[PDB]
Nucleic acid binder design. Structure first.
Lengths: 173, 1186
RNA sequence: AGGUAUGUCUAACUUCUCUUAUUUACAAACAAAAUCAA
């Protein structure tokens, strides 16, 4: 629907943008900001079409096409499980963490290694609350690399509430 | 850019017929030098007002007074110790005491004092809607339905004087049924029933008030709580013989009470009941009581909801003591009547709120109080008497009825050209066609041989002082002669071998017959014989073009060169010719001269080039010239007797008719008055009628147009007969007035009588023991394929039942071979009904039962066995009541409560072809209409019109426009594709238009893309969708185009492409309370500019009179003098919502009645044309626009 | 003279309280005085 436009000369005005894009598709709305401090255009606009069909069309035909004031015109189109784990071993690599938690569940992102107190801790992002419950059940208070690690939910207070299972189920759906 | 801005011209053709108020006073003394008689009545419906007299035992129109432009909410006459003038209360709160006076040559209504009260609107605080006057006329009392009561003390002097108002204010007590008790001059006392507005329980308590003339305030006397069932109060005059203590009659529902002021005597007498008690039976009530007293005998008449008319007398009960008794009995009854009066004469005027007001004289007076059988007494209050009603009508005798349609539910427009309106009669249940055309009787017609042209009638000279009169016909080849006598019409020298251009009588006992080749001078000889004393021939031979004549004078015009002037010799019978050449410089077309007098100045000559000249008859001179359009077809010159104006009526070829004021001395041609009637060369003839003697000219064309001139006005008109070839006045010993002999275009002689003429007051004639039909009509239908065939559907009051009565052409139809002209449908009741043709050769009828069942029928016309045969086809269950349905293409287009279903034709039952779910706003659909099957306008109870479009292959109607405001739409139509007519439950007549932003979109796009698909709406519309989704859900809005307020409730709109051939297409509406009016779109501008200026004049004209009357008082008539009521025009007509482009002609019409001094006083405010041209433009609307 | 054969040469990323005071304008076709047998 709405398309971002950038690399615009502040001398390009609103009527000029309108007359430009009406050549491509019908334009529902144009938001073309105006700096109050400098009393000038900040050189990027937003053109809301009547649908994402004309929007994407204008993205395809318009991108890297029109040359305005010698500068080219650019167009660009415009919640997960988290486990805190404490007392990790210094020999535990982030990739090793990935290998350890892959068997329990798919990771939406990579673990985050940080130090509290000296105390090696990490955040592990699971795509599923139930697979997170698996890595918890098996890995809680367990000894890896000759070091006892604790696996629980990371704080937001901590994840894993009743509404959390309900909505995380839906985000899975 | 052309501004759309539809300019509508409102006219009330027929004025509101439901008579809500009456008064018994004697207002004007007319036709008698010195006479004083209390027998007369003035009756008012809201705006409209009328004054009737009887004095003959038969009611008479006196004068229909000018439109007051307000809502009269009560009217009561007052009699003070003099001419009796009526006190009138209306909206604006003003108490307006008006006296009916004779001013100039007509009766005009003068106002004396108007007192401002409340504000201008119909309100609950407004001290109106309940009014009564002291029977001795000492004081008038107004009250409000709820808040307060005001009573003025009226005093008369050299000028009338209204005392300051006497206020009583009870905040929560809702007042109903004011009834004032007569007094002996002791003190005025009025009685009301107060129902408390704010209470936990329903409590209806009577309250007495004695106004104290000594202390000058109203005093609450006795507050008596009675059951909530209470209805009304009536005043018992004295009981002076039995035992200041007034006694009232409180009508309850199932029984009657009477109560003392001191509460000593409360008498309950149970009201009797019918034997049948058909179906739904209410506890009833008594709607109207009245009192009468003569010769120590005073009885009261109280009528129930069923119309049962009862009496009460009082008995002392001599055995016990002297104390009042109450005795009911039974009378002729009547239909339900809103109010009852009795003259000092034995005449009892029954004003029916249902349909018709009718007057009586009572003789039997009812059963005597001695009979214990049929009479009930106050002895035992618990008792019941059953009685069978009597249609034998022994007690009361109808003298006069007044034909009126108070409840006109529906109508259809029949015979579009003569604007004929087909509508039921509510009670009598007879077919009423009320017509704009002149009412024309036809009697003893006779078939003439084919191919006839013209006609003349000349008094037979052979028999002097005798009924015999010679009727002359003409054929192109032959001429027929006929003899006329009473009941004796016979056939007979002269010339039968040549056509007759003209024939006329000369002087006494002589005739001349002008024919194409030669003339004939004929004189009577003996009885059946005649002799030509001379014959005329062109010198070398010629074909005479035309001939005209006067009584003693004659003119004939031959082919080209010269004109021939003849006279008759006085003291003898002879013809002479002048020696002179009136060359006329062209070929004379036709000639015209006044035949009314023996000597007629100023011949009127026509030319084939299309010009008209005048001839001075010093001697001949051409003083004037008219270059008009097409060649003149025919022309006649007639001078009227009343004003003496000589009018030249000039008919033209192609159907344009014209008329001219002719100066006597100068002969100038001024005051052009034209018209366009039919397509045909017009013919003209002259006739004389009454209604004071009167003269008109009949015009023969595709239609027939009588052009007559009333006082200072004239209206061309169509006549009830389809066509008339030639027309001339006729007289017979069989009573003949307005009587005429004529011929239809079929070449068949016929005799007829014209009766009613469409004056400014009437503009219609209504073609329709006690007669009441149990069936109350419902709706009216007409077939699309048959141009006019009108089917009627009624209902039964009782067990659910229906009837269907079809009429086409003259009178109704038979049903099959049965004697009955109607069909009865048992157990079928009709909530709504419409006829449909699924196939072009088949005709079906559609009923919607209250059982929620859709019933299909089939109509049959037997055609020379001709009869209607109805046949039940299918049965279909419906979810909703189906308040509205109509014909879509091939289909039934019906509206459920929520949704619009389009039914097709299935077999064994009808099928749903498509269903369209309404927007959430629409609760129910009252009425709806289509534009050429493409578009719809759908109305609501609560909300307003919303237009839909049918999308094929989408199989759905898509709403493309909302409406601006909330309006309750009773009936709705289309003028166009983009505009809509609608009325309101509350009386607003409006017209809306889709915005050009929407018209561009729908003109440039297909409907299929509206619901889904790409339609590009301007930025503002979408921002109104997310900003205001509730109002702009339909993404467009109706800009108000026309708005108007007609105090009636409009039943039926009809858009007529022409009204009596008029060019400007009108829209005519019939209201529920009854009325028919029109909105004429004004072409050009200065039409609506002049009209607008005249309306602006007449609007404050009362104020202009007040400021002049004020200035003359500064150098040396109230404010509402000219309007007679306080309501301004713009205020009254604005009311609910301001009138937008509509200028109201019903006002400008009042300018016509005002005296020349007043009119010339008003028109001075304009730099524009004089009063005469004003009246020209005003009277132009009824003539030209319809 | 013609034809065939052979050789040689050359060309082709968005959707500024309170307080108590002072300063200054403004609004309301706001009201303008006297006389008193009011």
């Amino acid at each position: 629907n709405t398309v971002y436009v950038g690399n615009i000369d502040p001398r390009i005005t609103k009527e000029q943008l309108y007359e430009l894009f009406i050549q491509i598709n019908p334009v529902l709305r144009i938001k073309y900001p105006k700096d109050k401090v400098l009393q000038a255009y900040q050189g990027y606009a937003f053109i809301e079409f009547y649908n994402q069909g004309d929007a994407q069309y204008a993205i395809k035909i318009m991108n890297n096409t029109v040359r305005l004031y010698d500068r080219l015109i650019k167009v660009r189109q415009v919640p997960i499980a988290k486990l805190f784990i404490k007392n990790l071993a210094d020999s535990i690599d982030s990739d090793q963490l990935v290998k350890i938690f892959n068997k329990f569940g798919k990771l939406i992102r990579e673990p985050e290694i940080f130090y509290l107190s000296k105390l090696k801790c990490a955040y592990v992002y699971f795509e599923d609350f139930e697979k997170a419950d698996l890595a918890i059940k098996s890995l809680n208070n367990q000894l890896v690399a000759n070091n006892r690690i604790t696996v629980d939910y990371a704080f937001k207070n901590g994840k894993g509430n009743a509404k959390y299972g309900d909505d995380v189920d839906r985000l899975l759906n | 850019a052309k501004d759309d801005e539809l300019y509508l011209y409102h006219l009330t053709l027929k004025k509101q017929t439901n008579f809500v108020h009456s008064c018994i006073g004697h207002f004007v003394d007319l036709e008698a030098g010195s006479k004083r008689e209390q027998s007369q009545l003035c009756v008012a419906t809201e705006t409209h007002l009328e004054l009737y007299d009887t004095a003959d035992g038969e009611l008479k129109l006196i004068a229909k007074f000018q439109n007051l432009f307000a809502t009269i909410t009560s009217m009561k006459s007052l009699d003070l110790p003099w001419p009796t003038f009526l006190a009138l209360t209306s909206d604006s709160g003003n108490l307006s005491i008006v006296q009916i006076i004779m001013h100039a040559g007509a009766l005009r209504l003068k106002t004396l004092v108007n007192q401002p009260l409340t504000r201008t609107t119909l309100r609950r605080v407004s001290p109106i809607s309940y009014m009564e006057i002291d029977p001795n006329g000492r004081c008038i009392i107004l009250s409000s339905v709820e808040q307060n009561k005001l009573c003025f003390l009226v005093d008369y002097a050299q000028k009338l004087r209204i005392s300051s108002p006497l206020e009583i204010i009870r905040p929560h007590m809702v007042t109903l049924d004011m009834a004032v008790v007569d007094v002996n001059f002791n003190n005025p006392c009025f009685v009301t029933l107060e129902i408390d507005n704010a209470a936990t329980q329903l409590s209806v308590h009577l309250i007495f008030y004695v106004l104290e003339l000594g202390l000058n305030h109203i005093v609450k006397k006795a507050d008596y709580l009675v059951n909530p069932s209470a209805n009304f109060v009536l005043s018992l005059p004295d009981l002076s013989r039995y035992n200041f203590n007034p006694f009232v009659v409180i009508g309850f529902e199932n029984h009657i009470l009477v109560k003392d002021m001191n509460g000593f005597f409360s008498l309950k007498v149970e009201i009797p009941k019918r034997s049948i008690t058909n179906s739904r039976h209410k506890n009833v009530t008594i709607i109207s009581g009245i009192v009468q007293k003569l010769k120590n005998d005073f009885f009261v008449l109280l009528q129930s909801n069923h119309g049962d008319l009862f009496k009460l007398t009082v008995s002392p009960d001599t055995n016990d003591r002297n104390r009042p008794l109450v005795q009911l009995s039974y009378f002729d009854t009547i239909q339900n009547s809103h109010q009852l009066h009795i003259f000092k004469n034995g005449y009892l005027f029954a004003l029916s709120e249902m349909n018709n007001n009718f007057l009586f004289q009572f003789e039997k007076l009812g059963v005597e109080k001695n009979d214990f059988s049929n009479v009930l007494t106050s002895k035992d209050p618990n008792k019941s008497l059953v009685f069978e009603p009597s249609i034998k009508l022994q007690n009361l005798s109808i003298l006069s009825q007044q034909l009126n349609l108070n409840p006109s539910i529906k109508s259809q427009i029949v015979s579009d050209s003569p604007l004929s309106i087909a509508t039921k009669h509510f009670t009598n249940n007879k077919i009423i066609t009320l017509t704009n055309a002149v009412n024309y009787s036809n009697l003893i017609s006779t078939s003439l041989p084919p191919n006839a042209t013209k006609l003349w009638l000349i008094p037979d000279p052979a028999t002097t002082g005798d009924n015999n009169t010679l009727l002359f016909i003409t054929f192109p080849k032959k001429t027929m002669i006929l003899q006329i006598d009473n009941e004796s019409m016979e056939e007979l020298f002269k010339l039968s071998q040549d056509t007759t251009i003209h024939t006329c009588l000369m002087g006494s006992h002589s005739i001349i017959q002008v024919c194409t080749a030669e003339l004939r001078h004929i004189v009577p000889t003996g009885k059946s014989r005649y002799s030509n004393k001379l014959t005329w021939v062109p010198p070398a031979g010629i074909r005479i073009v035309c001939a005209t004549s006067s009584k003693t004078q004659l003119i004939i015009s031959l082919s080209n060169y010269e004109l021939v002037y003849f006279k008759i010799d006085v003291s003898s019978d002879s013809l002479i010719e002048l020696t002179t050449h009136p060359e006329l410089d062209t070929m004379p077309s036709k000639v015209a001269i006044v035949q009314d007098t023996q000597h007629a100045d100023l011949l009127a000559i026509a030319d084939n080039e299309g010009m008209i000249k005048i001839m001075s008859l010093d001697f001949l001179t051409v003083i004037s010239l008219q270059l008009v359009s097409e060649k003149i077809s025919d022309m006649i010159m007639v001078r009227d007797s009343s004003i003496g104006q000589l009018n030249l009526h000039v008919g033209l070829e192609n159907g344009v008719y014209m008329k001219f004021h002719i100066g006597d001395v100068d002969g100038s041609f001024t005051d052009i008055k034209r018209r366009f009637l039919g397509l045909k060369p017009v013919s003209l003839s002259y006739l004389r009628e009454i209604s004071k003697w009167m003269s008109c000219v009949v015009c023969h064309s595709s239609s027939t147009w009588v052009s007559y001139t009333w006082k200072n006005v004239w209206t061309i008109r169509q006549l009830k007969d389809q066509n008339m070839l030639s027309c001339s006045k006729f007289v017979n010993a069989d009573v003949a007035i307005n009587g005429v002999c004529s011929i239809s275009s079929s070449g068949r002689l016929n005799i007829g009588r014209v009766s009613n003429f469409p004056t400014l007051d009437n503009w219609f004639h209504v073609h329709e023991m006690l007669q009441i039909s149990t069936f109350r009509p419902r709706t009216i239908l007409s077939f699309p394929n048959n141009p006019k065939s009108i089917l009627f559907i009624d209902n039964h009051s009782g067990k659910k039942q229906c009837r269907i009565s079809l009429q086409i052409d003259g009178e109704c139809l038979k049903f099959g071979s049965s004697d009955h002209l109607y069909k009865i449908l048992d157990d079928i009741d009709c909530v709504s009904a419409a006829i449909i043709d699924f196939t072009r050769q088949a005709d079906h009828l559609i009923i919607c039962a209250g059982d929620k069942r859709l019933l299909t029928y089939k109509i049959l016309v037997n055609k020379d066995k001709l009869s209607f045969d109805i046949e039940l086809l299918h049965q279909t269950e419906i979810i909703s009541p189906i308040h509205a349905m109509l014909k879509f293409k091939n289909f039934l287009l019906t509206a459920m409560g929520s949704t619009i279903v389009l039914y097709g034709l299935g077999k064994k039952q009808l099928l749903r072809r498509s269903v369209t779910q309404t927007p959430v706003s629409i609760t129910k659909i009252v009425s709806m209409h289509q534009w050429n099957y493409e578009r719809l306008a759908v109305g609501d109870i609560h909300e307003s019109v919303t237009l839909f479009i049918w999308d094929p292959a989408g199989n759905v109607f898509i709403p493309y426009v909302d409406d601006s405001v909330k309006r309750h739409v009773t009936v709705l139509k289309f003028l166009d594709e983009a505009t809509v007519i609608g009325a309101d439950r509350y009386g607003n007549a409006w017209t809306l238009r889709s915005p050009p932003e929407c018209e561009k979109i729908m003109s440039n796009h297909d409907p299929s893309e509206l619901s889904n698909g790409a339609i590009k709406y301007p930025l503002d519309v979408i921002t109104l969708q997310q900003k205001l989704p509730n109002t702009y859900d339909c993404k467009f809005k109706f800009q108000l185009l026309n708005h108007f307020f007609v105090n009636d409730i409009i039943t039926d709109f009809h858009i007529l492409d022409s009204l009596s051939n008029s060019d400007r297409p009108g829209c005519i509406y019939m209201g529920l309370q009854g009325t028919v009016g029109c909105f004429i779109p004004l072409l050009s501008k200065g039409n609506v500019f002049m009209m607008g200026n005249i309306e602006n004049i007449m609007a404050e004209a009362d104020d202009t009179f007040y400021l002049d009357y004020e200035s003359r008082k500064k150098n040396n008539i109230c404010e509402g003098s000219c309007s007679i009521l306080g309501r301004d025009h713009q205020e009254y007509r604005s009311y609910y919502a301001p009138v937008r482009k509509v200028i109201d002609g019903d006002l400008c019409e009042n300018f016509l009645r005002l005296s020349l001094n007043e009119q010339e006083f008003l028109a001075k405010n304009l730099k524009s044309v004089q009063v005469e041209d004003i009246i020209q433009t005003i009277n132009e609307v009824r003539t030209n626009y319809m």
